[PDB]
Design an enzyme around this catalytic site. Structure first.
Site, PDB file in Angstrom:
ATOM      1  N   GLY B 113       0.846  -1.239   0.000  1.00 30.88           N
ATOM      2  CA  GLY B 113       0.000   0.000   0.000  1.00 30.88           C
ATOM      3  C   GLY B 113       0.852   1.248   0.000  1.00 30.88           C
ATOM      4  O   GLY B 113       0.555   2.241  -0.698  1.00 30.88           O
ATOM      5  N   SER B 114       2.035   1.222   0.681  1.00 31.16           N
ATOM      6  CA  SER B 114       2.943   2.326   0.695  1.00 31.16           C
ATOM      7  C   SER B 114       3.392   2.705  -0.708  1.00 31.16           C
ATOM      8  O   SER B 114       3.393   3.889  -1.121  1.00 31.16           O
ATOM      9  CB  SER B 114       4.205   1.992   1.551  1.00 31.16           C
ATOM     10  OG  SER B 114       3.882   1.782   2.946  1.00 31.16           O
ATOM     11  N   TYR B 140      -3.495   6.853   7.508  1.00 30.69           N
ATOM     12  CA  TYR B 140      -2.278   5.966   7.380  1.00 30.69           C
ATOM     13  C   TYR B 140      -2.201   5.564   5.878  1.00 30.69           C
ATOM     14  O   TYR B 140      -2.960   4.661   5.421  1.00 30.69           O
ATOM     15  CB  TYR B 140      -2.392   4.724   8.308  1.00 30.69           C
ATOM     16  CG  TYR B 140      -1.085   3.939   8.425  1.00 30.69           C
ATOM     17  CD1 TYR B 140      -0.496   3.262   7.286  1.00 30.69           C
ATOM     18  CD2 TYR B 140      -0.381   3.832   9.646  1.00 30.69           C
ATOM     19  CE1 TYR B 140       0.716   2.563   7.424  1.00 30.69           C
ATOM     20  CE2 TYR B 140       0.806   3.063   9.728  1.00 30.69           C
ATOM     21  CZ  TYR B 140       1.367   2.487   8.582  1.00 30.69           C
ATOM     22  OH  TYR B 140       2.539   1.729   8.720  1.00 30.69           O
ATOM     23  N   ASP B 241      -8.357   5.264  -0.799  1.00 31.71           N
ATOM     24  CA  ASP B 241      -7.367   4.243  -0.286  1.00 31.71           C
ATOM     25  C   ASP B 241      -8.146   3.158   0.397  1.00 31.71           C
ATOM     26  O   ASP B 241      -8.606   3.284   1.546  1.00 31.71           O
ATOM     27  CB  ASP B 241      -6.285   4.911   0.641  1.00 31.71           C
ATOM     28  CG  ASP B 241      -5.336   3.949   1.263  1.00 31.71           C
ATOM     29  OD1 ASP B 241      -5.562   2.733   1.080  1.00 31.71           O
ATOM     30  OD2 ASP B 241      -4.330   4.400   1.888  1.00 31.71           O
ATOM     31  N   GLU B 242      -8.352   2.021  -0.353  1.00 29.21           N
ATOM     32  CA  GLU B 242      -9.039   0.867   0.133  1.00 29.21           C
ATOM     33  C   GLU B 242      -8.093  -0.290   0.455  1.00 29.21           C
ATOM     34  O   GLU B 242      -8.493  -1.470   0.411  1.00 29.21           O
ATOM     35  CB  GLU B 242     -10.174   0.463  -0.859  1.00 29.21           C
ATOM     36  CG  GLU B 242     -11.260   1.577  -0.913  1.00 29.21           C
ATOM     37  CD  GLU B 242     -12.625   1.084  -1.297  1.00 29.21           C
ATOM     38  OE1 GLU B 242     -12.930  -0.139  -1.332  1.00 29.21           O
ATOM     39  OE2 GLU B 242     -13.501   2.020  -1.457  1.00 29.21           O
ATOM     40  N   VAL B 243      -6.837   0.041   0.774  1.00 29.41           N
ATOM     41  CA  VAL B 243      -5.828  -0.995   1.139  1.00 29.41           C
ATOM     42  C   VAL B 243      -6.320  -1.866   2.285  1.00 29.41           C
ATOM     43  O   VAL B 243      -6.129  -3.100   2.243  1.00 29.41           O
ATOM     44  CB  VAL B 243      -4.463  -0.402   1.371  1.00 29.41           C
ATOM     45  CG1 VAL B 243      -3.484  -1.401   2.042  1.00 29.41           C
ATOM     46  CG2 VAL B 243      -3.865   0.140   0.072  1.00 29.41           C
ATOM     47  N   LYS B 244      -6.952  -1.282   3.305  1.00 31.69           N
ATOM     48  CA  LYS B 244      -7.369  -2.042   4.493  1.00 31.69           C
ATOM     49  C   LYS B 244      -8.815  -2.578   4.383  1.00 31.69           C
ATOM     50  O   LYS B 244      -9.103  -3.683   4.858  1.00 31.69           O
ATOM     51  CB  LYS B 244      -7.211  -1.188   5.784  1.00 31.69           C
ATOM     52  CG  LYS B 244      -7.441  -1.903   7.108  1.00 31.69           C
ATOM     53  CD  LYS B 244      -6.312  -2.810   7.523  1.00 31.69           C
ATOM     54  CE  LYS B 244      -6.287  -3.324   8.959  1.00 31.69           C
ATOM     55  NZ  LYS B 244      -5.812  -2.308   9.915  1.00 31.69           N
ATOM     56  N   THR B 298      11.966  -3.933  -9.639  1.00 28.79           N
ATOM     57  CA  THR B 298      12.280  -5.090 -10.493  1.00 28.79           C
ATOM     58  C   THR B 298      11.250  -6.203 -10.412  1.00 28.79           C
ATOM     59  O   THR B 298      10.914  -6.782 -11.494  1.00 28.79           O
ATOM     60  CB  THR B 298      13.679  -5.596 -10.128  1.00 28.79           C
ATOM     61  OG1 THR B 298      14.637  -4.516 -10.269  1.00 28.79           O
ATOM     62  CG2 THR B 298      14.136  -6.684 -11.093  1.00 28.79           C
TER      63      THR B 298
HETATM   64  C1  LIG Z   1      -1.760  -0.569   6.126  1.00 28.09           C
HETATM   65  N1  LIG Z   1      -1.669  -0.109   7.481  1.00 28.09           N
HETATM   66  C2  LIG Z   1      -1.085  -0.487   8.886  1.00 28.09           C
HETATM   67  C3  LIG Z   1       0.155  -1.108   8.333  1.00 28.09           C
HETATM   68  C4  LIG Z   1       1.286  -1.519   9.342  1.00 28.09           C
HETATM   69  C5  LIG Z   1       0.812  -2.453  10.420  1.00 28.09           C
HETATM   70  C6  LIG Z   1      -0.157  -1.781  11.323  1.00 28.09           C
HETATM   71  N2  LIG Z   1      -1.555  -1.907  10.777  1.00 28.09           N
HETATM   72  C7  LIG Z   1      -2.072  -1.272   9.682  1.00 28.09           C
HETATM   73  O1  LIG Z   1      -3.230  -1.612   9.315  1.00 28.09           O
HETATM   74  C8  LIG Z   1      -2.187   0.430   5.153  1.00 28.09           C
HETATM   75  C9  LIG Z   1      -1.372   0.975   4.123  1.00 28.09           C
HETATM   76  C10 LIG Z   1       0.047   0.627   3.964  1.00 28.09           C
HETATM   77  O2  LIG Z   1       0.188  -0.689   3.318  1.00 28.09           O
HETATM   78  P1  LIG Z   1       1.620  -1.432   3.579  1.00 28.09           P
HETATM   79  O3  LIG Z   1       1.803  -1.640   5.081  1.00 28.09           O
HETATM   80  O4  LIG Z   1       1.412  -2.768   2.873  1.00 28.09           O
HETATM   81  O5  LIG Z   1       2.685  -0.609   2.960  1.00 28.09           O
HETATM   82  C11 LIG Z   1      -1.892   1.979   3.335  1.00 28.09           C
HETATM   83  N3  LIG Z   1      -3.263   2.393   3.472  1.00 28.09           N
HETATM   84  C12 LIG Z   1      -4.022   1.876   4.427  1.00 28.09           C
HETATM   85  C13 LIG Z   1      -5.353   2.402   4.608  1.00 28.09           C
HETATM   86  C14 LIG Z   1      -3.508   0.943   5.304  1.00 28.09           C
HETATM   87  O6  LIG Z   1      -4.237   0.470   6.358  1.00 28.09           O
HETATM   88  C1  LIG Z   2      17.918  -2.674  -9.314  1.00 30.85           C
HETATM   89  N1  LIG Z   2      18.095  -1.884 -10.499  1.00 30.85           N
HETATM   90  C2  LIG Z   2      17.486  -1.622 -11.919  1.00 30.85           C
HETATM   91  C3  LIG Z   2      16.073  -1.810 -11.477  1.00 30.85           C
HETATM   92  C4  LIG Z   2      14.929  -1.457 -12.494  1.00 30.85           C
HETATM   93  C5  LIG Z   2      15.046  -2.192 -13.800  1.00 30.85           C
HETATM   94  C6  LIG Z   2      16.252  -1.760 -14.552  1.00 30.85           C
HETATM   95  N2  LIG Z   2      17.449  -2.573 -14.135  1.00 30.85           N
HETATM   96  C7  LIG Z   2      18.117  -2.504 -12.943  1.00 30.85           C
HETATM   97  O1  LIG Z   2      19.018  -3.362 -12.740  1.00 30.85           O
HETATM   98  C8  LIG Z   2      18.658  -2.217  -8.143  1.00 30.85           C
HETATM   99  C9  LIG Z   2      18.075  -1.674  -6.965  1.00 30.85           C
HETATM  100  C10 LIG Z   2      16.630  -1.450  -6.823  1.00 30.85           C
HETATM  101  O2  LIG Z   2      15.936  -2.715  -6.529  1.00 30.85           O
HETATM  102  P1  LIG Z   2      14.342  -2.726  -6.893  1.00 30.85           P
HETATM  103  O3  LIG Z   2      14.174  -2.450  -8.386  1.00 30.85           O
HETATM  104  O4  LIG Z   2      13.957  -4.164  -6.565  1.00 30.85           O
HETATM  105  O5  LIG Z   2      13.667  -1.733  -6.025  1.00 30.85           O
HETATM  106  C11 LIG Z   2      18.911  -1.204  -5.974  1.00 30.85           C
HETATM  107  N3  LIG Z   2      20.338  -1.356  -6.076  1.00 30.85           N
HETATM  108  C12 LIG Z   2      20.877  -1.870  -7.172  1.00 30.85           C
HETATM  109  C13 LIG Z   2      22.314  -1.898  -7.285  1.00 30.85           C
HETATM  110  C14 LIG Z   2      20.079  -2.259  -8.229  1.00 30.85           C
HETATM  111  O6  LIG Z   2      20.613  -2.697  -9.408  1.00 30.85           O
END
Ligand SMILES: */C(=N\[C@@H]1CCCCNC1=O)c1c(COP(=O)(O)O)cnc(C)c1O
Ligand SMILES: */C(=N\[C@@H]1CCCCNC1=O)c1c(COP(=O)(O)O)cnc(C)c1O
Lengths: 439, 439
Positions: B113-114, B140, B241-244, B298
């Site tokens: 969700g982030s 959140y 934001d309907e993540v939850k 990636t």
């Molecule tokens: C999720 N919210 C928090 C997350 C951390 C644990 C505590 N309990 C909660 O419900 C969330 C997000 C963020 O998703 P992510 O944690 O997968 O990044 C974004 N939007 C909403 C509404 C919620 O609840």
């Molecule tokens: C990954 N690097 C890029 C990613 C996007 C596609 C193009 N080719 C590449 O190799 C990466 C990351 C970021 O990881 P993430 O994409 O899973 O968030 C961080 N550090 C390094 C060195 C690399 O290559």
């Protein structure tokens, strides 16, 4: 484009999925995979020299990934590490710490290299009080606001940068800063930049031990050990980003083993998950224990992805993949040197293990980059049944990061397909290749 | 702590994994799961009323998740959507767009969700030129630098906030802003804040249709439709934001269906992946097609996680889970009203479907929050074999977000265990509960 091409998997992708996350070079449209081969919607097979940017460490459908993921999905230890301890995540954390030079370090789990680098930076700044950071031009640490803040590549050029970011040239043996092949000029630069800012103000220095998106650049001998000495004299934490070149791919388990230093913090990702989203930070306890409920996402440390990561570590041992990567990388670079005896476009062949780069130039004396020819070459390769991409700030470096489990026979066949692509790159028209934006 | 407790799974978790991502309330230490039950290292079973914060939409080991994940792991369509189209991701994108009011919208895939909320904000600001944003205190939206910039909850209180962030009070029927139960005072506030800034300067407004971490707050009738009218009069994109609370949990497929408006952008996550990391943005094409190679990681759109998401959507239809969530939520809230006839600590019971909250107070007239008693109650529950957590800015709202597949018999048993936990919360000592930091 008529209705048949619009109705095929690539056409459907254009109508259903936004361009925002796309990085496309040719109309690759996948429905399956087996070993080191992809299979398209129509049933055509291709050999994958990209290994999905290094994510497919064990290739496609490896028995150890099937076993682990199927087992965990049928009896999952909840879904998270946030509000529960779980057995697969704790086992994975103990295996990762055992691999890193006892007692002093703990682990943080994420989904991506982006979220791992971001969490390492926030944690040091929280624990030390320091806000400044050192990184390199061409460095790729992620594509989130928090990770783009100390990156240096073109993908992040328009992003907001951290307060106190010091960006340095990455020393390239093929194009040396200040015409100094050793990199000593970059070290002297760093010392001057540290003198213009308040003492003890820098939290961290991020470094790739081979720059991948920046051009598959291996730094000059001894540079990185000297750089790490400077940082330690100023109390600055050294963070080694092995997301791309980590975990056996270099021919040593950890790439820093080639470089005569041990970092304070190690960042892992991509092939750690074997095709599932998994990243890790290995850091001093005082850094990762400075706060709680601070850098957390709900599915972090889920048992399905942790089981995949344990399978990757176990398979690197059981199939002797560190030694394999060394042996096969030599074979690949020997093949590429034979192609350079007939294809004048090849200016340089470099890398470690199964992280290899081939830099394409218009003339060997001038070293002028050959961007347009590189984009057509990989298009022709795709038509012939071989997938690879390009990297670099000038768009002219072929990247090869195949599955660690690619066979020697597959390496030889891939070199033979590349030979044809060099010979026939001009058969790809200007108008066809311009339909793909690349980078 | 002696060596046996140090050597158990919870002790091992303390030695191996940093506190940085932990949100712990009691020493829950999981080795397996089946249906709506968790199983600890020692073999003890617990009923999970949290459903892993709503991530475990189909519970643990559901046959449709086993089938999908096992099938995709054995024949994966590569590992990504970045540099390839793949069949599972495109099928999932077409199913998500078909669920949302044809032709106008496309999808972006993420891990969390982030990352989804962050990508929605960056895309609008890139496509419109606008940089300002509206959100709510208690909201959140994530725990990354880019998503914390327009959040309002205590987890994000010390984060850097966006330029042009306007933060508003979320209208709570139990504690109304300006003593106006309708929320009209918050609407009038918004109009004044928009007048103090340049016209056409706001890109977006982010809203939760039920605030979860903020307290399981359902807004007053008609507020959200009126709010969305204001935003549309100023050219501001409405992001729901309907993540939850998304995907059947409210007793309607999409929570906004209760509220008499349709958003411009819908954000999904948590239970979308059934225990695997999967998020989505559904947005106008012009928003998601304004750039390429812009917001990308990636493993985004990997086929294993896309197959899990297709299994969740398919199972919501095949097991009639929208109707089930409505029916079972009524049964749960009826049970809780019976407990309120004997336990004076219960001040309010609220929510939709299987998103329920129970607010604990020291006195029903004063409505003074009861933080310490809430923390002991859920500790006692854990000892008795029931997992649930608390939410809210005052730490006094029990949250219940069970698997959609929890049976009626399991709901009744969970209410009976809660009755005992209310009766015996004072048996948990001050010193025991203070070993868990919570939030
Ligand atoms: C999720 N919210 C928090 C997350 C951390 C644990 C505590 N309990 C909660 O419900 C969330 C997000 C963020 O998703 P992510 O944690 O997968 O990044 C974004 N939007 C909403 C509404 C919620 O609840
Ligand atoms: C990954 N690097 C890029 C990613 C996007 C596609 C193009 N080719 C590449 O190799 C990466 C990351 C970021 O990881 P993430 O994409 O899973 O968030 C961080 N550090 C390094 C060195 C690399 O290559």
């Amino acid at each position: 484009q008529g209705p048949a091409m619009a109705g095929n998997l690539y056409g459907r992708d254009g109508a259903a999925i936004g361009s925002l996350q796309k990085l496309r070079f040719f109309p690759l449209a996948v429905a399956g995979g087996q070993g080191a081969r992809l299979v398209e919607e129509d049933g055509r097979e291709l050999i994958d020299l990209s290994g999905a940017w290094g994510a497919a460490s064990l290739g496609y459908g490896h028995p150890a990934i099937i076993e682990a993921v199927s087992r965990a999905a049928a009896n999952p230890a909840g879904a998270s590490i946030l509000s529960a301890s779980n057995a697969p995540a704790v086992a994975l954390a103990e295996r990762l710490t055992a691999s890193f030079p006892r007692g002093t370090h703990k682990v943080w789990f994420g989904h991506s290299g982006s979220d791992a680098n971001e969490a390492a930076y926030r944690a040091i700044t929280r624990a030390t009080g320091r806000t400044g950071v050192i990184a390199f031009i061409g460095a790729y640490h992620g594509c989130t606001v928090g990770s783009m803040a100390f990156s240096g590549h073109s993908v992040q050029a328009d992003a907001a940068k951290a307060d106190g970011l010091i960006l340095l040239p990455y020393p390239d043996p093929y194009r040396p800063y200040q015409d100094d092949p050793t990199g000593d000029a970059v070290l002297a630069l760093l010392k001057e930049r540290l003198a213009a800012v308040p003492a003890g103000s820098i939290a961290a220095a991020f470094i790739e031990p081979i720059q991948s998106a920046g051009g598959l650049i291996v730094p000059p001998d001894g540079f990185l050990r000297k750089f790490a000495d400077i940082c330690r004299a100023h109390g600055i934490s050294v963070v080694c980003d092995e997301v791309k070149v980590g975990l056996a791919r270099s021919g040593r388990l950890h790439c820093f083993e080639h470089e005569g230093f041990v970092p304070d913090i190690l960042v892992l990702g991509k092939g750690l998950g074997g095709g599932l989203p998994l990243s890790a930070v290995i850091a001093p306890a005082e850094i990762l224990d400075c706060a709680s409920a601070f850098a957390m996402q709900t599915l972090h440390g889920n048992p399905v992805c942790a089981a995949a990561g344990l399978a990757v570590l176990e398979t690197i041992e059981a199939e002797n993949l560190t030694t394999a990567a060394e042996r096969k990388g030599k074979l690949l670079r020997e093949g590429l040197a034979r192609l350079a005896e007939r294809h004048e476009l090849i200016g340089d062949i470099r890398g470690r293990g199964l992280a290899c780069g081939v830099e394409l130039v218009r003339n060997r004396q001038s070293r002028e980059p050959a961007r347009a020819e590189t984009a057509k070459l990989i298009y022709r390769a795709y038509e012939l049944g071989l997938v690879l991409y390009y990297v670099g700030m000038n768009g002219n470096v072929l990247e090869m990061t195949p599955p660690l489990t690619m066979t020697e026979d597959e390496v030889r066949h891939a070199v033979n397909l590349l030979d044809q692509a060099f010979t026939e790159l001009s058969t790809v028209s200007d108008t066809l290749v311009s339909q793909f934006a690349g980078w």
